[PDB]
Amino acid sequence: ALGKLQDVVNHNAQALNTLVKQLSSKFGAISSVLNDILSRLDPPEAEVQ
Amino acid sequence: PTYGVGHQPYRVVVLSFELLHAPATVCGPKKSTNLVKNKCVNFNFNGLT
Amino acid sequence: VYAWNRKRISNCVADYSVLYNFAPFFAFKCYGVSPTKLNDLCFTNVYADS
């Protein structure tokens, strides 16, 4: 009966979850963690990553 | 030995590692510090900052 | 090169500063890690292929 309102709630949390999920994406880089990139590379290539 | 560079024998050693996806057994010379509870700290556990 | 030697390195603490101190290494090229950051990191699956 109350599907419409729950749908709005369902969309909002899912959008945030997707955005949160996007932090675990390498995006063509060596790692998805910035701290690892800083701890592992010199600034000329760390800047690229 | 009479040949010029580009044909002289070269010794190559390849050091291969893996990054953080397993328990680590080879570490750097950094000294271990004591553990503190319930405070905001910047920690380094086995290369994870 | 056809029968290259592979040595496993494990359960040790490595000082890379001495590698810098004495070095006739004309080529010293690293791909996935900085040469100067090696003393601050922990590793496993370490292999030397000679």
Side-chain angles (χ1 to χ4, degrees):
Chain A
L2 270 309
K4 302 187 62 45
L5 310 182
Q6 188 69 65
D7 193 4
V8 178
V9 171
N10 286 358
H11 292 299
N12 288 306
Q14 170 199 261
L16 288 176
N17 290 340
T18 301
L19 185 74
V20 160
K21 175 69 66 74
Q22 282 296 96
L23 286 183
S24 74
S25 299
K26 311 246 173 185
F27 293 122
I30 55 160
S31 185
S32 58
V33 178
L34 281 171
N35 283 333
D36 292 8
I37 291 181
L38 294 174
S39 82
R40 279 164 58 179
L41 293 181
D42 280 337
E45 60 268 18
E47 160 166 358
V48 178
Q49 304 300 310
Chain B
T2 55
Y3 289 96
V5 291
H7 298 290
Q8 281 177 26
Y10 270 67
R11 282 179 181 212
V12 175
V13 168
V14 184
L15 300 178
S16 177
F17 301 100
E18 80 90 15
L19 262 305
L20 214 68
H21 285 73
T25 44
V26 181
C27 286
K30 292 199 59 180
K31 297 285 99 181
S32 310
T33 305
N34 193 353
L35 58 93
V36 294
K37 299 280 185 154
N38 307 80
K39 263 173 295 291
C40 185
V41 289
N42 44 329
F43 48 80
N44 190 338
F45 283 77
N46 308 11
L48 175 70
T49 60
Chain C
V1 71
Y2 91 99
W4 50 272
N5 182 59
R6 185 166 191 106
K7 185 166 178 58
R8 178 176 175 81
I9 287 97
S10 60
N11 191 6
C12 75
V13 46
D15 190 5
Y16 302 88
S17 192
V18 302
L19 266 65
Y20 263 109
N21 290 344
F22 51 97
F25 310 143
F26 291 99
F28 184 80
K29 186 198 306 177
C30 297
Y31 274 74
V33 63
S34 168
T36 191
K37 296 290 184 171
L38 287 178
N39 278 41
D40 299 335
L41 302 186
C42 278
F43 301 110
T44 180
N45 271 266
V46 183
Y47 292 99
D49 310 332
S50 61

PDB file of all heavy atoms in Angstrom, chain A residues 13-24:
ATOM      1  N   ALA A  13      18.784   6.046  -0.123  1.00  0.00           N
ATOM      2  CA  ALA A  13      19.808   5.249   0.534  1.00  0.00           C
ATOM      3  C   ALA A  13      20.665   4.545  -0.498  1.00  0.00           C
ATOM      4  O   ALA A  13      21.902   4.578  -0.405  1.00  0.00           O
ATOM      5  CB  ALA A  13      19.169   4.240   1.483  1.00  0.00           C
ATOM      6  N   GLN A  14      20.018   4.052  -1.565  1.00  0.00           N
ATOM      7  CA  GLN A  14      20.737   3.346  -2.614  1.00  0.00           C
ATOM      8  C   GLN A  14      21.709   4.271  -3.313  1.00  0.00           C
ATOM      9  O   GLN A  14      22.870   3.892  -3.532  1.00  0.00           O
ATOM     10  CB  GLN A  14      19.750   2.750  -3.611  1.00  0.00           C
ATOM     11  CG  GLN A  14      20.352   2.192  -4.867  1.00  0.00           C
ATOM     12  CD  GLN A  14      19.317   2.063  -5.959  1.00  0.00           C
ATOM     13  OE1 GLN A  14      18.773   0.985  -6.192  1.00  0.00           O
ATOM     14  NE2 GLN A  14      19.015   3.175  -6.614  1.00  0.00           N
ATOM     15  N   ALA A  15      21.300   5.535  -3.516  1.00  0.00           N
ATOM     16  CA  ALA A  15      22.183   6.494  -4.162  1.00  0.00           C
ATOM     17  C   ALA A  15      23.408   6.748  -3.306  1.00  0.00           C
ATOM     18  O   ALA A  15      24.540   6.628  -3.798  1.00  0.00           O
ATOM     19  CB  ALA A  15      21.436   7.796  -4.440  1.00  0.00           C
ATOM     20  N   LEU A  16      23.197   6.889  -1.989  1.00  0.00           N
ATOM     21  CA  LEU A  16      24.317   7.095  -1.084  1.00  0.00           C
ATOM     22  C   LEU A  16      25.204   5.866  -1.046  1.00  0.00           C
ATOM     23  O   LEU A  16      26.435   5.991  -1.133  1.00  0.00           O
ATOM     24  CB  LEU A  16      23.815   7.439   0.316  1.00  0.00           C
ATOM     25  CG  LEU A  16      23.200   8.825   0.484  1.00  0.00           C
ATOM     26  CD1 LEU A  16      22.660   8.995   1.892  1.00  0.00           C
ATOM     27  CD2 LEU A  16      24.223   9.898   0.169  1.00  0.00           C
ATOM     28  N   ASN A  17      24.580   4.678  -1.073  1.00  0.00           N
ATOM     29  CA  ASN A  17      25.349   3.442  -1.058  1.00  0.00           C
ATOM     30  C   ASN A  17      26.193   3.323  -2.310  1.00  0.00           C
ATOM     31  O   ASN A  17      27.395   3.033  -2.216  1.00  0.00           O
ATOM     32  CB  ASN A  17      24.419   2.241  -0.908  1.00  0.00           C
ATOM     33  CG  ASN A  17      23.803   2.156   0.471  1.00  0.00           C
ATOM     34  OD1 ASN A  17      24.312   2.743   1.425  1.00  0.00           O
ATOM     35  ND2 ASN A  17      22.699   1.428   0.584  1.00  0.00           N
ATOM     36  N   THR A  18      25.618   3.709  -3.462  1.00  0.00           N
ATOM     37  CA  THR A  18      26.363   3.664  -4.713  1.00  0.00           C
ATOM     38  C   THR A  18      27.535   4.625  -4.659  1.00  0.00           C
ATOM     39  O   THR A  18      28.661   4.260  -5.027  1.00  0.00           O
ATOM     40  CB  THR A  18      25.447   3.985  -5.889  1.00  0.00           C
ATOM     41  OG1 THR A  18      24.382   3.030  -5.930  1.00  0.00           O
ATOM     42  CG2 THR A  18      26.215   3.883  -7.188  1.00  0.00           C
ATOM     43  N   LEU A  19      27.304   5.811  -4.083  1.00  0.00           N
ATOM     44  CA  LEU A  19      28.361   6.803  -3.991  1.00  0.00           C
ATOM     45  C   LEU A  19      29.450   6.312  -3.052  1.00  0.00           C
ATOM     46  O   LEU A  19      30.642   6.389  -3.380  1.00  0.00           O
ATOM     47  CB  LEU A  19      27.773   8.136  -3.533  1.00  0.00           C
ATOM     48  CG  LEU A  19      28.679   9.358  -3.483  1.00  0.00           C
ATOM     49  CD1 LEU A  19      28.943   9.849  -4.890  1.00  0.00           C
ATOM     50  CD2 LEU A  19      28.008  10.439  -2.672  1.00  0.00           C
ATOM     51  N   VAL A  20      29.033   5.646  -1.967  1.00  0.00           N
ATOM     52  CA  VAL A  20      29.975   5.046  -1.033  1.00  0.00           C
ATOM     53  C   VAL A  20      30.728   3.918  -1.719  1.00  0.00           C
ATOM     54  O   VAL A  20      31.958   3.804  -1.592  1.00  0.00           O
ATOM     55  CB  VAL A  20      29.220   4.580   0.225  1.00  0.00           C
ATOM     56  CG1 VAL A  20      29.995   3.557   0.971  1.00  0.00           C
ATOM     57  CG2 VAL A  20      28.947   5.757   1.130  1.00  0.00           C
ATOM     58  N   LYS A  21      30.014   3.152  -2.557  1.00  0.00           N
ATOM     59  CA  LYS A  21      30.616   2.041  -3.281  1.00  0.00           C
ATOM     60  C   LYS A  21      31.665   2.554  -4.253  1.00  0.00           C
ATOM     61  O   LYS A  21      32.683   1.884  -4.480  1.00  0.00           O
ATOM     62  CB  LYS A  21      29.523   1.245  -4.000  1.00  0.00           C
ATOM     63  CG  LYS A  21      30.005   0.115  -4.888  1.00  0.00           C
ATOM     64  CD  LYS A  21      30.587  -1.012  -4.054  1.00  0.00           C
ATOM     65  CE  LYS A  21      29.515  -1.674  -3.202  1.00  0.00           C
ATOM     66  NZ  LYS A  21      28.616  -2.539  -4.014  1.00  0.00           N
ATOM     67  N   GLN A  22      31.470   3.778  -4.769  1.00  0.00           N
ATOM     68  CA  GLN A  22      32.409   4.331  -5.731  1.00  0.00           C
ATOM     69  C   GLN A  22      33.767   4.632  -5.105  1.00  0.00           C
ATOM     70  O   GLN A  22      34.740   4.821  -5.842  1.00  0.00           O
ATOM     71  CB  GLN A  22      31.829   5.593  -6.363  1.00  0.00           C
ATOM     72  CG  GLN A  22      30.796   5.310  -7.440  1.00  0.00           C
ATOM     73  CD  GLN A  22      31.377   4.586  -8.633  1.00  0.00           C
ATOM     74  OE1 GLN A  22      31.297   3.363  -8.730  1.00  0.00           O
ATOM     75  NE2 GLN A  22      31.965   5.338  -9.549  1.00  0.00           N
ATOM     76  N   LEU A  23      33.857   4.691  -3.768  1.00  0.00           N
ATOM     77  CA  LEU A  23      35.166   4.851  -3.147  1.00  0.00           C
ATOM     78  C   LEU A  23      36.034   3.604  -3.275  1.00  0.00           C
ATOM     79  O   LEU A  23      37.254   3.699  -3.108  1.00  0.00           O
ATOM     80  CB  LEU A  23      35.015   5.227  -1.674  1.00  0.00           C
ATOM     81  CG  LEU A  23      34.562   6.659  -1.400  1.00  0.00           C
ATOM     82  CD1 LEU A  23      34.510   6.932   0.092  1.00  0.00           C
ATOM     83  CD2 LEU A  23      35.479   7.648  -2.094  1.00  0.00           C
ATOM     84  N   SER A  24      35.445   2.442  -3.564  1.00  0.00           N
ATOM     85  CA  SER A  24      36.209   1.209  -3.695  1.00  0.00           C
ATOM     86  C   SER A  24      36.613   0.917  -5.135  1.00  0.00           C
ATOM     87  O   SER A  24      36.955  -0.226  -5.452  1.00  0.00           O
ATOM     88  CB  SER A  24      35.417   0.031  -3.123  1.00  0.00           C
ATOM     89  OG  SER A  24      34.361  -0.343  -3.989  1.00  0.00           O
TER      90      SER A  24
END
